[PDB]
Design a protein around this ligand. Structure first.
Ligand code: ZN
Ligand code: ZN
Ligand code: ZN
Lengths: 196, 84, 392, 242, 686, 210, 194
RNA sequence: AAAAAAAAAA
């Protein structure tokens, strides 16, 4: 009795909690189509907002749109859709968060971040488990977090740091290959014409 | 890795990161009493002399632009065009 | 200085071998005395050795004959009688110890395996991921399987003179390795020969002998370069001694009455080593030698890392924990973040700002005392020789 | 110098003006202090205006004003009605004149006595400047605090925004040239710190037995202490120069 | 020297400055530095640094100087602007009734150092010589500046009426040929917003001219403010007694309405809405009633204020304040909310012991029925303390994780580098982007463009863009006889126009494919309408006179423009494919705006105007490219971490209309930074 | 209830498989792409309980356009858990028809012993596996998924020569990605991604399968 | 002098900041420092619930006096009328209770507790009584008449839960308030003349 | 002269 009261499911998805039915009032969740005159018409179709993400049991339903339905869970998009869809979903979520407060950031700064997010083909995080696991140098990784562990890993593995970053050259004190320091100036011997 | 002049695929327009360092290096060279290529109109701050001889593109500085494949292209001052 | 000033191109990390540590050190015979002052003069072989560096503003180095600004400091060495674990390398050491054999010191999976070759060509230039893949491959191995005559399942088979060599398995079960701090225990779930008991404690000497007899080829598949990073060099046998630049003499009033924490910790290291070498030479009991090894390992670990949980904290004289080298590096106020990332500038000023509407935006109003204190280092040119002459 | 009101109107003195160069009323009244109206609605201080009006009323009448909260006996309209009887405007506004020229101000201005409190954050206790001074006995960096004559802290976000500007020479100046420059001699084969006697001009590597292949490297002092500390941790940061 | 305020949250929080020696012991600078530095002059300690090498001084001059850093690459907007009483007197000085004498404009004349010593003829010549505010702001504006915006108090019905070009209220703001003509300026026109006067005077004149224009505004405006004056008082906080009676009656009616709502909820007559419970439905109804009453009373208070009320003029100047500030001054404070909810029952079913148990009326709820001018009851003053503590708590708590997120973001992209081939690479040289921002352009020199070939109907596309030669009456009144003889001598012009129409149809189809929701606003450099207006004004283009520009020359100029405006170079197929992939929106905008009908019937451009236009377009598209040698990763990290400090402003005035669990603000970006391993509020929009 | 839903999901899975074969460059007719549910009921049946159609009855053989002897099998086993016995049965069918490509659509699971079997039979015959739940939704038809194009080795060499690129410093994509499984991408191939850009119209990137 | 509240050798486990240097800048600063209350929660918690100013702080602590920074909502100042309980022995209240009518726990059946009202003295259950209203009125009379129970002793009649709680311990904070019966104050004009 | 603690300003 406790088993059939607390565990079994009559209908629905066990990973989905409260479900709401609503009509959108703005031209963002409406269906925008092209009429015969060439104008854009926004149709306010009925739509679902469910708490809990499992779209293997949602998109595979009888009357669910397989195209416009997305999710806010980035890892599940990675194990369902792909890494470029992860990039697009992260860009869309960042745009939604910035437009909730009305703050506008340019698309290029967001796209650079989102292409950094998909650099290795999987989901790297801006933490000590995604930055320190990169193929970068030792002073790239120790100067952010876990300095001693990265230093002993480089010492034990005899890791070669090729001095290509900026904080590496900041530590060792010469001009970094960065910004206006990414080139060398040479004196032209032939161009030394008449002077004073 | 000497890239030939006809093989150079970098831009022909000198950006401000090159402009600041070439102006500073040339004005420093004048500050150690280098010969001045153009006529002087009473200017005493060698940074101003560095601009007014950068206008006629008579500064003997070769810019060694570094490509990501560890190859370098040499661009002269008069080959590049002033823009601001 | 008639030395060529060139730009360094790359940094090669590695582990200092004890032969290299003995070769770097200017202290011939090792540091033997924990006393810093001996009758108003520095003592050779002590913690205030003149060969390591300078003492005060009027003294000179015994080695390079320089002042504070000229002498960079020269390292010493302490020859420990018995090797001890490096605690920070412990999290690496078991990663080799669970991959190499406990008895014949060979590899749990034979290096001509196609999976090993696929890992090697997959992880070229990535030694950490190579070691991770090796440890993932060797997590399920519990028996040192090997033998060239272990594949005799066929009947009337002529032996092949062009046959490759097979795996070398001493026929022994590799124990599970457990740890509760610095102590290392090995347990055999399956019983070996009757001369070996099921639960043993493994000292640093057994691990040193195990990692000593590993060939360079097995170290290469382990992702660990034998030229600079041999695995037997992680166990501290010769302890490096930092110079007086790393551990400065703190002056109180006229003369330096007290030293820093590192000098006192190295004094504890010297006293521990002297007590151990006195007890082992006297033919003392086994529990005395075990206690000496335990306290020497405790002093070595607290010299390295005093922030290890499950490990007794080092007691300073002022009711504080000891500040180790890890505390010097790791932290916001550490040597990386507070001294290399964020080192202070010289020519700077700071004051309270007030508005000025008639000034243009590309101008700042500067007080007279700040403009007198802060200086612009202008070069001398013939264009403005008279103006700089009247300025000076 | 930092001044403040009794309603949170903190600020600093932008400038000082003599009596002949600032605004005066028809009665020749030069105020002690002038403030910004734009600080009023954002801070939402109507009680400052009520305090000013009650101060004008109590100074014209000759009584100590009562500012007890949640009191129905004190009202803005009552103070206005009592202030109207003393020959002034009922909202406390006054007509002033220009100080430089003498012309009437087109917009009528609100004047009266309030209660202002000085603060201890004087500029004499906060001004600091430093060209060159003491360096630390460990890292050879400037001191901390004005009493020890220490320099400013070129923090992390300074490096962040200078990388955002992308000017490498200012970074090389602030983090190598004016903080802790040092010169070390390095063996080419070993890549570690070698012995260099500058008096007889001799160079010797104690492990590589190297006497000629010794190079000179300029570096920050804190990086040198990091390398020496790593050399204490059985780590070899071999810095080859070829 | 280098001038820096801590904490430095972005790129614009440290400038380069020129030293002027002043006697007193403080730092002195312009007021417009207060917006990028986030300074408040309330005890702000701030640092200055001196370069010790003169090549670094040259780097400060060429990079770190303030006028070269006017436009942020974060949101393509200015960061300094005209603020405070300078902006208030700009608003009060451009008014139509401001008639200013010869002596006062004479006083204002010497504070313009860029003036050419040519005084204008007065607007009024007899009987007394009088100038006006727009005539003397015209002298401040240099060069060729043309501009259309609107004031913040512009009615929406004025634009479709017959008075859209002649405003009785002087609301639409027009600038032609670098002299101010029409409208009153405000925060929209002289602020940090995109498309302002400051943005276009930076983009059209240069860094130094705009930076001098900034200083040329403020001295003249502050010297005119000595003549005019500006002052708020206790009389500005008091409205009409009829307005006060109306506000009190509206508040009493709202209290009676919420009492009736409580009564019908107690009588089992409140039907719960779907998506939420009866508790949430009742709370949402009460919050909506109180917020609507507060907004209605604030609107009634704002409408009843006169033009002499300096608080209303200061708010509509846009320098400080808003409408909710005016409502809290005059009408009422509103409902105090803790975490966007009701004041919690700290006692047993009571917020205070002075109320009754199980009371849901607005006195015990937290609604404030009195204004701050009238004074508060002690209970609602305690509820205002409840509300005001939460803002300080929200300021104090999240800023640790905000700074941690900023440091993590600036450490992860510390070496994302634009190289000399136009590609984007990290420290290890791994390719991230083939072009920066997928177009190879910098974020400073881009702006907002309206796209005309997206929203419109097919018949409007045919009657608006298809060039027809059959209408000979329009052909005669638009073109001169030389163009007719020139095109009748040729034969390929008809199929050339047909190919142009086919290219426009294909571009419209591609734009509809790219944008499915019909977004007609894009982010592109080189605003075409502004420079077409500029070459109209420079060359004195008459829009009621026939021109001598053949459409074949227009098509040849457009083709030469699109051939000479390259980003990805090379004759390879991959290089050409990347060239038309990077410049597709630019090609679409060029073909949509430089059509054969716009330049002939609408804009009526000449030949020399057309060649000046194509030269200007080529030059401005060349200089708007991304500079090889520019750090973009740390710039992106700072430009995303700067709004992370400004998402605490919308904490208050929240009730929630939907009972959906969603994470908003710091946590959202925090999770997207950890790859959102587990969504804080997992939701599907199906 | 079970028969109609089973027929509907079998028709949807068959349509997804046929679209996958069409996306891989194989010889795919238009009527099989546009096969309706009623067309599937007429051609194969509507009662999957009484073997109309059977799970082994629906077996799809498709050929390549350029190379007609390069073909793909699609297998639908009926059991939920796949052992090495049915894998070996498919293999013994697979050598005797001289074809190097097949995809088995599992229902519930497919064992790690058979995972190792499919690993060590890989460089003679390609035998990919797919879950029935993953094949109810076309991956490439989603609005978040841009255009993916498989690219040959000559165009890859042209891309490396034009941009001076090396393969280790390319953008990467994992081999376990559902997009890479949809196209059957192996390690070393480079996929071209064409996406819509709001600042330039469209953008083309290149990813390395690893 | 140091401020560490414990042993010198084991001061790492002791609280810091209990003893502070007195702020002699103004008289008001000295009075604010003499009436300061410090929360034991550390100044690094991301939880906002201890930092929220509670509804029960009416007249106990000052609502608009907190330092700015990370210590907001923790350091507070006392109200002008608030008074800290010194502490008193709970003995004679207990003897008065057991002599008046109260029935002890060790002399009653366990099945006769649900109808009666429990009595708690400093968190200690003592017994039950079946007339809580008359007992609470008698306790109020004895506290007002200053005979046995001092005015410092707090007492609660939980009517909905049938409990009586008596607190005599230190650490309590009280406000002196007027007494109202029958819609009228007990303070008269005779008290004003006195 | 170091370290710890407390009080603050932005
Ligand atoms: Zn020396
Ligand atoms: Zn073995
Ligand atoms: Zn050497």
């Amino acid at each position: 009795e406790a088993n059939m009261l607390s565990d079994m499911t009559l209908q629905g998805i066990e990973a989905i909690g409260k479900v709401y039915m609503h009509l959108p009032q703005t031209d963002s969740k409406k269906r925008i189509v092209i009429t015969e005159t060439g104008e854009f018409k926004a149709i306010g179709e009925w739509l679902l907002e469910t708490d809990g993400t499992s779209m293997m049991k949602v998109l595979s339903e009888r009357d669910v749109d397989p195209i416009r339905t997305s999710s806010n869970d980035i890892c599940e998009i990675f194990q369902v859709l792909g890494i470029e869809a992860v990039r697009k979903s992260v860009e869309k979520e960042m745009n939604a968060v910035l437009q909730f407060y009305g703050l506008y950031v340019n698309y290029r700064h967001l796209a650079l971040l989102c292409d950094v997010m998909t650099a290795k083909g999987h989901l790297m995080a801006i933490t000590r488990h995604g930055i320190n696991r990169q193929d970068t140098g030792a002073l790239m990784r120790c100067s952010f977090e876990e300095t001693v562990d990265v230093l002993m890993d480089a010492a034990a593995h005899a890791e070669t740091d090729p001095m290509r970053g900026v904080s590496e050259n900041i530590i060792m004190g010469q001009l970094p290959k960065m910004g206006t320091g990414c080139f060398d100036l040479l004196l032209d011997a032939e161009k030394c014409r008449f002077g004073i | 890795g000497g890239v030939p002049k006809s093989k150079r695929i970098t831009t022909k327009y000198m950006t401000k990161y090159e402009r600041a360092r070439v102006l500073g290096t040339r004005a420093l060279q004048i500050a150690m009493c280098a010969p001045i290529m153009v006529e002087l109109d009473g200017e005493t701050d060698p940074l101003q002399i560095a601009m007014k001889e950068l206008k006629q593109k008579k500064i003997p500085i070769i810019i060694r632009r570094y490509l990501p494949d560890h190859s370098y292209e040499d661009w002269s001052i008069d080959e590049l065009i002033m823009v601001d | 200085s008639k030395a060529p000033l060139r730009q360094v191109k790359r940094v090669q990390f590695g582990i200092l071998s004890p032969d290299e540590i003995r070769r770097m050190s200017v202290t011939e015979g090792g540091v033997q005395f924990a006393e810093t002052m001996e009758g108003g003069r520095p003592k050779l072989g002590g913690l205030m050795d003149p060969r390591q560096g300078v003492i005060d503003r009027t003294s000179r180095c015994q080695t390079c004959a320089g002042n504070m600004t000229e002498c960079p400091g020269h390292f010493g060495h302490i020859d420990l009688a018995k090797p001890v674990f490096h605690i920070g390398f412990i999290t690496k050491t078991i990663k080799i110890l669970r991959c190499v054999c406990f008895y014949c010191s060979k590899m749990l999976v034979s290096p001509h395996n196609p999976k090993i070759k696929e890992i090697v060509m997959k992880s070229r230039g990535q030694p950490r991921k190579r070691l991770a893949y090796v440890y993932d491959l060797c997590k399920g191995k519990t028996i040192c399987e090997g033998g060239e005559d272990m594949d005799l399942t066929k009947e009337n088979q002529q032996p092949d003179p062009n046959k490759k060599p097979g795996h070398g398995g001493c026929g022994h079960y590799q124990p599970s390795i457990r740890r509760t701090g610095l102590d290392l225990t090995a347990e055999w779930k399956h019983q070996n020969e009757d001369s070996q008991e099921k639960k043993i404690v493994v000292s640093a000497e057994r691990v040193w002998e195990i990692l000593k007899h590993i060939t360079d080829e097995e170290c290469f598949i382990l992702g660990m370069d034998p030229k600079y990073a041999r695995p037997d060099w992680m166990i501290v046998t010769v302890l490096p001694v930092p110079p007086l630049a790393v551990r400065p003499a703190v002056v109180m009033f006229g003369a330096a009455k007290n030293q820093d924490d590192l000098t006192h910790k190295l004094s504890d290291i010297i006293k521990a080593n002297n007590e151990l070498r006195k007890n082992e030479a006297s033919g003392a009991a086994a529990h005395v030698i075990q206690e000496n090894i335990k306290m020497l390992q405790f002093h070595v670990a607290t010299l390295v890392d005093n922030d290890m949980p499950g490990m007794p904290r080092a007691m300073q004289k002022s009711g504080k924990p000891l500040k180790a080298i890890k505390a010097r590096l790791k932290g916001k106020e550490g040597r990386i973040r507070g001294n290399l990332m964020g080192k202070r500038v010289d020519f700077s000023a700071r004051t309270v700002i007030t508005p000025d509407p008639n000034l243009r935006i590309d101008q700042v109003g500067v007080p007279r005392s700040i403009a007198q204190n802060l200086t612009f280092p202008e070069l001398v040119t013939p264009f403005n020789i008279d103006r700089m002459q009247e300025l000076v | 110098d930092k001044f403040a009101s009794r309603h949170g109107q903190k600020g600093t003195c932008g400038i000082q003006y003599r009596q002949e160069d600032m605004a005066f009323t028809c009665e020749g009244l030069a105020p002690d202090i002038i403030i910004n109206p734009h600080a009023i609605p954002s801070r939402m201080t109507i009680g400052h205006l009520i305090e000013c009006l009650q101060g004008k009323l109590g100074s014209n009448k000759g009584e100590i004003g009562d500012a007890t909260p949640f009191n129905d006996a004190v009202n803005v309209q009552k103070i206005s009605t009592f202030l109207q009887e003393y020959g002034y405007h009922l909202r406390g506004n006054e007509v002033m004149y220009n100080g430089h020229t003498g012309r009437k101000i087109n917009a009528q201005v609100f004047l009266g006595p309030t209660y202002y409190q000085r603060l201890k954050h004087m500029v004499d206790d906060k001004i600091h400047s430093r060209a060159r001074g003491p360096v630390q006995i460990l890292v050879r960096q400037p001191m901390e605090g004005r009493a020890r004559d220490g320099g400013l802290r070129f923090g992390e976000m300074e490096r962040d925004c200078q990388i955002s500007h992308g000017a490498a020479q200012f970074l090389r100046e602030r983090l190598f040239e004016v903080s802790d420059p040092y010169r070390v001699h390095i063996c080419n084969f070993c890549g570690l710190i070698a012995i260099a006697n500058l008096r007889n001009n001799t160079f010797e590597c104690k492990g590589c037995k190297n006497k000629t292949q010794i190079s000179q490297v300029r570096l920050p002092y804190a990086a040198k202490l990091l390398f020496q500390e790593l050399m204490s941790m059985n780590i070899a940061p071999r810095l080859m120069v070829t | 020297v280098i001038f820096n305020r801590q904490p430095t949250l972005h790129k614009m929080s440290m400038m380069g400055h020129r030293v002027k020696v002043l006697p007193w012991s403080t730092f002195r600078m312009n007021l417009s530095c207060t917006s990028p530095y986030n300074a408040d002059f309330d005890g702000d300690e701030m640092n200055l640094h001196v370069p010790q090498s003169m090549e670094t001084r040259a780097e400060v001059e060429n990079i770190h100087i303030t006028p070269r850093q006017i436009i942020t690459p974060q949101a393509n907007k200015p960061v300094m602007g005209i603020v405070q009483d300078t902006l208030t007197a700009v608003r009060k000085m451009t008014k139509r009734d401001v008639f200013i004498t010869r002596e006062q404009v004479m006083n204002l004349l010497m504070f313009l150092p860029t003036w050419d010593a040519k005084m204008p003829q007065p607007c009024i010549l007899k009987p007394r010589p009088l100038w006006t505010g727009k005539q003397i702001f015209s002298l401040i504006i240099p060069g060729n500046v043309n501009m259309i915006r609107t004031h913040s108090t512009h009615p929406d019905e004025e634009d479709e009426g017959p008075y859209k070009w002649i405003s009785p209220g002087d609301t639409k703001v027009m600038v032609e040929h670098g002299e101010l003509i029409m409208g009153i300026l405000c925060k929209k026109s002289l602020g940090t917003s995109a498309g302002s006067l400051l943005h276009i005077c930076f983009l059209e004149l240069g860094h130094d001219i705009a930076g001098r224009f900034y200083g040329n505004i403020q001295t003249v405006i502050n010297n005119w403010l000595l003549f005019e004056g500006h002052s708020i008082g206790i009389g500005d906080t008091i409205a009409d007694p009829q307005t006060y009676n109306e506000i009190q009656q509206a508040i009493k009616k709202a209290k009676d309405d919420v009492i009736n709502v409580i009564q019908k909820a107690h009588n089992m007559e409140l039907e719960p809405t779907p998506g939420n419970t009866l508790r949430q439905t009742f709370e949402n109804k009460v919050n909506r009633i109180l917020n609507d009453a507060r907004d209605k009373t604030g609107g009634s208070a704002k409408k009843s204020l006169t033009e002499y009320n300096n608080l209303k003029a200061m708010v509509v100047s846009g320098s400080k304040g808003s409408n909710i500030n005016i409502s809290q001054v005059i009408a009422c404070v509103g409902q105090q909310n803790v975490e966007g909810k009701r004041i919690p029952y700290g006692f047993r079913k009571r917020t205070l012991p002075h109320f009754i148990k199980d009371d849901y009326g607005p006195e015990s709820r937290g609604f404030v029925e009195n204004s701050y001018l009238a004074g508060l009851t002690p209970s609602e003053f305690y509820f205002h303390a409840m509300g005001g503590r939460e803002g300080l708590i929200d300021t104090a708590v999240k800023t640790a994780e905000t700074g941690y997120i900023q440091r993590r973001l600036i450490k992860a992209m510390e070496s994302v580098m634009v190289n000399y081939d136009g590609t984007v690479r990290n420290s290890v040289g791994q390719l991230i982007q083939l072009r920066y921002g997928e177009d190879g352009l910098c974020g400073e020199l881009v702006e907002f463009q309206n796209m005309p070939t997206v929203k419109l109907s097919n018949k409007s596309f045919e009657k608006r863009f298809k060039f027809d030669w059959s209408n000979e009456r329009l052909m005669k009144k638009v073109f001169t006889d030389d163009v007719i003889k020139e095109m009748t001598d040729s034969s390929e012009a008809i199929q050339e126009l047909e190919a142009e129409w086919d290219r426009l149809v294909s571009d419209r189809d591609s734009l509809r494919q790219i944008f499915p929701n019909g977004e007609s606003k894009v982010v592109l450099p080189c605003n075409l309408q502004r420079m077409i207006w500029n070459v109209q004004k420079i060359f004195h283009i008459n829009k009621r006179l026939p021109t001598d520009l053949s459409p074949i020359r227009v098509i040849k100029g457009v083709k030469t423009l699109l051939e000479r405006c390259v980003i990805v170079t090379g004759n390879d197929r991959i290089s050409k494919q990347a060239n038309e992939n990077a410049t597709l929106l630019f090609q679409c905008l060029i073909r949509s705006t430089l059509c054969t009908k716009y330049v002939s019937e609408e804009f009526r451009l000449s030949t020399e105007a057309f060649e000046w236009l194509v030269g200007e377009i080529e030059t401005r598209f060349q200089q708007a490219q991304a500079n090889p040698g520019e750090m973009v990763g740390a710039l992106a990290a700072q430009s995303l971490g700067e709004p992370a400090t400004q998402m605490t402003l919308n904490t208050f005035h929240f009730a929630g209309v939907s009972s959906k669990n969603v994470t908003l603000g710091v946590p959202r970006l925090k999770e997207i930074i950890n790859i959102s391993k587990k969504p804080k509020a997992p939701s599907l929009t199906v | 209830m079970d028969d109609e839903a089973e027929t509907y999901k079998l028709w949807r899975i068959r349509k997804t498989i046929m679209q996958l074969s069409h996306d891989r460059g194989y010889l795919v007719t238009q009527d099989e792409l546009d096969q309706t549910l009623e067309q599937f009921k007429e051609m194969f049946g509507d009662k999957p309980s009484e073997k109309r159609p059977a799970r082994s009855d629906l077996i799809v053989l498709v050929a390549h356009n350029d190379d007609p002897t390069d073909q793909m099998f699609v297998f639908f086993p009926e059991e939920p858990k796949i052992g090495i016995k049915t894998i070996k049965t498919y293999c013994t069918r697979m050598q005797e028809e001289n074809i190097h490509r097949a995809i088995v659509v599992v229902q519930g699971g497919m064992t790690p012993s058979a995972k190792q079997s499919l690993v060590d039979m890989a460089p003679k015959y390609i035998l990919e596996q797919f879950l029935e739940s993953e094949l109810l939704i076309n991956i490439t038809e989603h609005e978040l998924v841009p255009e993916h194009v498989v690219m040959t080795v000559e165009e890859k060499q042209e891309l490396l020569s034009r941009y001076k690129l090396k393969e280790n410093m390319l953008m990467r994509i994992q081999a376990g990605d559902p997009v890479a499984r949809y196209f059957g991408l192996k390690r070393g191939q480079v996929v071209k991604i064409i996406r819509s850009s709001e600042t330039a119209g469209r953008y083309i990137s290149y990813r390395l399968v690893c | 002098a140091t401020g560490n509240w414990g042993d010198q050798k084991k001061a790492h486990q002791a609280r810091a900041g209990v003893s502070q240097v007195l702020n002699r800048l103004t008289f008001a600063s000295t009075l604010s420092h003499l009436r300061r209350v410090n929360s034991p929660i550390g100044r690094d918690g991301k939880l906002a619930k201890p930092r929220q100013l509670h509804n029960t702080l009416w007249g106990m602590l000052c609502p608009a006096e907190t330092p700015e920074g990370a210590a907001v909502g923790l350091v507070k100042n006392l109200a002008l009328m608030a008074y800290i309980s010194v502490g008193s022995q709970p003995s004679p209240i207990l003897e008065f209770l057991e002599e008046w009518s109260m029935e002890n726990l060790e002399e009653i059946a366990p099945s006769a507790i649900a109808d009666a009202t429990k009595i708690f003295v400093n968190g200690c259950w003592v017994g039950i009584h079946r007339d809580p209203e008359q007992l609470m009125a008698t306790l109020r009379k004895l506290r007002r008449q200053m005979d046995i129970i001092v005015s410092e002793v707090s007492m609660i009649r939980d009517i909905r839960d049938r409990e009586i709680r008596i607190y005599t311990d230190a650490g309590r904070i009280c406000r002196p308030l007027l007494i109202v019966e029958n819609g009228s104050l007990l303070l008269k004009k005779t008290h004003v003349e006195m």
